[PDB]
Amino acid sequence: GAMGSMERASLIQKAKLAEQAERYEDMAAFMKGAVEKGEELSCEERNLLSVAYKNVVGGQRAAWRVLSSIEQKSNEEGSEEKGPEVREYREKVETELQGVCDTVLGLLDSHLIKEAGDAESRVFYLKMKGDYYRYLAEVATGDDKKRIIDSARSAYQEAMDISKKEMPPTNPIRLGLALNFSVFHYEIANSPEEAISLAKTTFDEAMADLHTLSEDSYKDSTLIMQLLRDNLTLWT
Amino acid sequence: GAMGSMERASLIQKAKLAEQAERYEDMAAFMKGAVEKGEELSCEERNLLSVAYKNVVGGQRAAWRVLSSIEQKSNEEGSEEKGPEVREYREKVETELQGVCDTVLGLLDSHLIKEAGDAESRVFYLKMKGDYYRYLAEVATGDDKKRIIDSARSAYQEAMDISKKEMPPTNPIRLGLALNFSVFHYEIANSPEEAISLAKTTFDEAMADLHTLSEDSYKDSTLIMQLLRDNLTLWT
Amino acid sequence: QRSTSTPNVH
Amino acid sequence: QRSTSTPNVH
Ligand SMILES: [Cl-]
Ligand SMILES: [Cl-]
Ligand SMILES: [Mg+2]
Ligand SMILES: [Mg+2]
Ligand SMILES: [Mg+2]
Ligand SMILES: [Mg+2]
């Protein structure tokens, strides 16, 4: 790895600089290098890893959606067929996206998840595993779409089981996991009723626990609660 | 070159797709491949080349400015010196920026400029040469800042001489060249009075020629004229 | 319009 | 604030 000669602390320092510079491909490479040092990650470091790769894959997902839409339009009765280029370039972006997802899943499997024993770290990583299988599912078609969906579901479910046992219903890790699992149900798994039920129960149980929170924690929890509400408004 | 096996027309098609997807690094690679086919570029193709690399170098310039500002703050009396990382990462981004500039200058020198005989193509390319030397100047310090500035100046001046002989004062190529040369004078060459004089004369001579233009051409010219005015307001 | 997932938090 | 140069035009 090209980051193998750099100090762990230097990699984290540069990841933060890259964040400030909006250089998210660099940020992701720095954080991959930090993970590959083999030590567990702190909360701040886990967040840097997530911010970096979410921004990278987010650009890829947006581009893939643009190209897929153009491709679908080109494949309609009455469209002047324009050769293989749209498909080729959509496939190029898709392969790069799948590569980023495989890289993140590889870091989780070797060996972030198995060394994560505290609930806050383990739930975070299992949610990430669900998320990156979900991004793979967004572009999957053939035989393996079913298996990718099941892998996402399994990771989210393990994370949910731990979060419900070990975290209060306002915990922002737990809330964002439930948010993303509800998105999985609506957008990937063709289960809008499950999505709505999960979003509603999550919201209501968090509402009832807000009285226990400080001002700052209340702001964190209610921000995610608003996203649950936004989706429920979209969905109903 | 990795684009050597792709058809010229396919490269241009994919450059346009990459533009739609906001994938400007890809767009630039496709257009580099198209240039390296060795044929001259049409107006639309020259514009794709410019859009692609301007977006790539624009991200680099923004990132470099963020990192340079952090570095300058770290090098002030009373700043906890935090090791070599800020400088290292600023240097990394700077080297990547210089590489992009060198790539563009290389395409212009081999062989876009020497095959460009019409004023619209030759002025466009010489302006581009001035622009990418100007971006090099923005990060230059040592012995070669002076020589880089002179290279930018020389390219802009050749472009100006041709534009004044061969194009009307409202021509958008001529207007944008004058705009960028005025920016060179103010921001790079420590010549704010030259910048103001050039912006003012350019604006006034274009004003007096607007009556010759169609509605669509008038919209093009007045858009650039507004940028001259914006700068004159900033500068005075 | 697509559903909203957890955003980045600096 | 930095001076404005020629923007991109699609
Ligand atoms: Cl391709
Ligand atoms: Cl570095
Ligand atoms: Mg037809
Ligand atoms: Mg594929
Ligand atoms: Mg001190
Ligand atoms: Mg240097």
Residue of A nearest to B23 (CA): A63
Cβ distance D1 to B224 less than 8 Å, yes or no, reads no
Please give the structure tokens belonging to residue B134.
Answer: 């100007």
Contacts of A92 in chain B (CB under 8 A): 26
Cβ distance A21 to B88 less than 8 Å, yes or no, reads no
Cβ distance B179 to D8 less than 8 Å, yes or no, reads no
Nearest to B152 by CA among B162, B163, B140: B140
Residue of C nearest to A232 (CA): C3
The number of the ligand nearest the C-alpha atom of B77 reads: 5
Q: Are A8 and A40 in contact (CB under 8 A)?
A: no
Peptide linkage before B111 cis (omega within 30 of 0): yes
Q: Are A129 and A113 in contact (CB under 8 A)?
A: yes
Query: Judged by CB atoms within 8 Å, which residues 4-23 of A form the interface with B?
Result: 10, 13-14, 17-18, 20-23
DSSP code for B55 = H
- Tokens 């050749």, located at residue: B158
Peptide linkage before A111 cis (omega within 30 of 0): yes
Q: Are B163 and B141 in contact (CB under 8 A)?
A: no
Q: Are A153 and A166 in contact (CB under 8 A)?
A: no
* C-alpha to C-alpha distances, B214 to B173, B220, B221, D7, D8, nearest whole angstrom: 17, 10, 10, 22, 22
Of A179, A230, A234, which is closest to C6 when you measure between CB atoms?
A179
Which positions ≥6 away from B48 have C-beta within 8 Å? B12, B15, B16, B19, B27, B31
Nearest to A24 by CA among B69, B162, B63, C7: B63
Q: State which amino acid sits at residue A229.
A: R
Q: How was this structure determined?
A: X-ray
Q: E-strand spans in chain B?
A: none
> How far away is chain A from the Cα of C5, in angstroms, using its nearest Cα?
5
Cβ distance C3 to A47 less than 8 Å, yes or no, reads no
Which positions ≥6 away from A50 have C-beta within 8 Å? A124, A128, C8
Q: State which amino acid sits at residue B154.
A: S
> How far away is chain B from the Cα of D10, in angstroms, using its nearest Cα?
8
Whether chains B and A touch (3+ CB pairs under 8 A) is answered by yes
Burial B55-76 (b: 16+ CB within 10 A, else e): bbbebbbebbebbbebeeeeee
Cα(A187)–Cα(A61) distance, rounded to whole angstroms? Answer: 14
Q: State which amino acid sits at residue B33.
A: G
Resolution to one decimal, Å: 1.6
Cβ distance C4 to A227 less than 8 Å, yes or no, reads yes
Q: State which amino acid sits at residue A163.
A: S
Domains and CATH numbers, chain B: 8-235 (1.20.190.20)
Cα(B16)–Cα(B14) distance, rounded to whole angstroms? Answer: 5
Residue of A nearest to C6 (CA): A176
Residue B40, φ and ψ in degrees, nearest 5: -60, 160
Nearest to A212 by CA among A164, A166, A169, A178: A169
Q: State which amino acid sits at residue C2.
A: R
Which candidate in A19, A23, A87 is best for mutational testing of the B interface (most B CBs within 10 A)? A23
Please give the structure tokens belonging to residue A99.
Answer: 């590569």
Residue of A nearest to B61 (CA): A21
Of B55, B195, B235, which is closest to D8 when you measure between CB atoms?
B55
Cβ distance B83 to A14 less than 8 Å, yes or no, reads no
User: DSSP assignment of A166-202, as one string?
Assistant: HS-TT-HHHHHHHHHHHHIIIIISS-HHHHHHHHHHH
Burial A167-196 (b: 16+ CB within 10 A, else e): bebbbbbbbbbbbbbbbbbbbbbebeeebb
User: DSSP assignment of B172-221, as one string?
Assistant: HHHHHHHHHHHHIIIIISS-HHHHHHHHHHHHHHHHTTGGGS-HHHHHHH
Residue of A nearest to C8 (CA): A51
- Other Cβ atoms closer than 10 A to A111: 12
Nearest to A61 by CA among B92, B44, C5: C5
Ligand 5 centroid, distance to A40 Cα (angstroms): 29
> How far away is chain A from the Cα of B157, in angstroms, using its nearest Cα?
34
Q: State which amino acid sits at residue A91.
A: E
